Amino acid sequence: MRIGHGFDVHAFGGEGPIIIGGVRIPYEKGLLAHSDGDVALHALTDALLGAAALGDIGKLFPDTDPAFKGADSRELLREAWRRIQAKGYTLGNVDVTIIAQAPKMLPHIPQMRVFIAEDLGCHMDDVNVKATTTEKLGFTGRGEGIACEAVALLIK
Template identity: 45%
Template sequence: MGKIKVGFGFDVHQLRSQHPFVLGGVNLEHHSGAFGHSDADVLLHAICDALLGAANLRDIGFHFSNTDDRWKGISSLVLLQHVVVLLKEKGFTIGNIDAMVCLEAPKINPHIPAMKIHIAQAASISEEDISIKATTNEQLGFIGREEGVVAYAVCLIERD
């Protein structure tokens, strides 16, 4: 048996009116969207942080600084592809990813199959190895007021 490592990722972005909302590589129709330096895909950012953490490669901000114009407006699927390259350079493969998105609206369950396809392609893994879940914050706090969106992710990586 090879080396197995687990990582945890978290990300949060504020929601802004009339701003695009990209989640899991999917453009969602909604009156507001996540705001940030890249496409502000909170789900992919949490996944990237989980993978980087598991491989002891620091965090997403270290690799893709929000002060670097190369990453301004970039698809977070590209960031995930870069992270996978970093993992491969250290001899790791992804075992699985489990993620949770917390937001009041829009409902993302209808979009989860498309998100899994995008993530699987970017990470070079099977859709069967990706779990995406969603919950609300029961109208409590900044999430409940639809001022922000949060994502959590855990992953397992392995090296032979």
């Protein structure tokens, strides 16, 4: 009954591990962002919110508002989901597409699913995650950063 679309990108820099779909992945560099740069969750939240017609992470997570300043993506997703259910919506299914030249996400997909299908209730079958390489082409191909696109569905 309601469709949503999210999109988000983040740039590299900072040694430490990166976090995607709530999973800590080892890698040369880390992701910037003044919040743990979880492009996957951020794009997922935006999809969900955009389908409920509630904004785009700037309603709960602005940037200069003491409401939700320092918090990880898992908390925001969880908060965003609460407001969405407040408007009487329930999850149908969500599909997430991660775009990066490296590192390899294939081995982490399942753990990501577990996290996501946990912070939204629902069973894993209602959550899909996949990654794509881009073939060393754009800013993602040159390893300058990482991007993610997501879609979602709601009800009754």
